[PDB]
Amino acid sequence: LYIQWL
């Protein structure tokens, strides 16, 4: 799993 929020 990889999550990014910017």
Numbering used by the authors: 1 to 6
Please give the exact wording used by the authors of the publication that reports this structure.
APRTc5b does not contain gatekeeper residues and is thus capable of amyloid formation over a broad range of pH (2 < pH < 11). Four polymorphic crystal forms were grown from solutions of APRTc5b. Although the chains in polymorph B are also arranged according to the class 8 topology, different interactions stabilize the interfaces. While in polymorphs A and C Tyr, Gln, and Trp form H-bonds at the β-sheet/β-sheet interface with each other, this arrangement allows their interactions with water molecules and chain termini. Polymorphs formed in pure aqueous solution are laterally displaced, as the side chains of Tyr, Glu, and Gln rather form H-bonds with the surrounding water molecules.
Here, we identify an evolutionarily conserved hexapeptide sequence as the major aggregation-prone region (APR) of gastrointestinal peptides of the glucagon family: xFxxWL. We determine nine polymorphic crystal structures of the APR segments of glucagon-like peptides 1 and 2, and exendin and its derivatives. Our results highlight the dual role of short aggregation core motifs in reversible amyloid formation and receptor binding.
